[PDB]
């Protein structure tokens, strides 16, 4: 709290994303918090580590942070909720990503 600061706010929020099973997904979200919130990513409550098996996180200090899914499958279908946690509080926004099952997917 204190003073001389600005509460976190998603000046660019996520939306309802849709993808075919096995295909890559790229999405990003921008905040106007001050100080710049330590943007955290987690999927259905599952904390995401930057540069994981399929979950690549890139946080720009400018205020824009991106999350890329290399291969979004039915097990990756869910809500990639983003949290703008900073000294002035925290705000959650739903990163909904739905996956269409593909019967022709040999990697399924």
UniProtKB/Swiss-Prot annotation:
It is found in: Cytoplasm, Cytoskeleton; Cell junction, Focal adhesion; Cytoplasm, Myofibril, Sarcomere, Z line; Cell projection, Ruffle. Phosphorylated predominantly on serines and, to a lesser extent, on tyrosines. The modification Phosphoserine is found at residue 108. Detected in both muscle and non-muscle tissues and cells (at protein level). Isoform 3 is widely expressed, isoform 4 is particularly abundant in tissues rich in smooth muscle and in the cardiac muscle and isoform 1 is detected in heart. It comes from the Eukaryota. Disruption phenotype: Death around 15.5 dpc due to severe neural tube closure defects and herniation of liver and intestine. Palld-deficient mouse embryonic fibroblasts display disorganized actin cytoskeleton, decreased polymerized filament actin, and decreased cell adhesion and compromised cell spreading on various extracellular matrix. Mice embryos lacking Palld exhibit defects in erythropoiesis. Residues 8-92 form the Ig-like C2-type domain. Belongs to the myotilin/palladin family. Interacts with EPS8. Interacts with LASP1. Interacts with VASP. Interacts with ACTN. Interacts with SORBS2. Interacts with PFN1. Interacts with LPP. Interacts with SPIN90. Interacts with SRC. Interacts with EZR. Interacts with RAI14. Cytoskeletal protein required for organization of normal actin cytoskeleton. Roles in establishing cell morphology, motility, cell adhesion and cell-extracellular matrix interactions in a variety of cell types. May function as a scaffolding molecule with the potential to influence both actin polymerization and the assembly of existing actin filaments into higher-order arrays. Binds to proteins that bind to either monomeric or filamentous actin. Localizes at sites where active actin remodeling takes place, such as lamellipodia and membrane ruffles. This is Palladin. It comes from Mus musculus (Mouse). The chain holds residues 1022 to 1126 of 1408 of the full protein.
């Amino acid at each position: 709290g204190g003073s001389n600061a600005t509460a976190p706010f998603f000046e660019m929020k996520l939306k309802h994303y849709k993808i075919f099973e096995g295909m890559p997904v790229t999405f990003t979200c921008r905040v106007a918090g001050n100080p710049k919130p330590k943007i955290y990513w987690f999927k259905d409550g599952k904390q995401i580590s930057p540069k994981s098996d399929h979950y690549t996180i890139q946080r720009d200090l400018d205020g824009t942070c991106s999350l890329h899914t290399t291969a979004s499958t039915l097990d990756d279908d869910g809500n990639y909720t983003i949290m703008a946690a900073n000294p002035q509080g925290r705000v959650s926004c739903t990163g909904r990503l739905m996956v269409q099952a593909v019967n022709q997917r040999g990697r399924s």
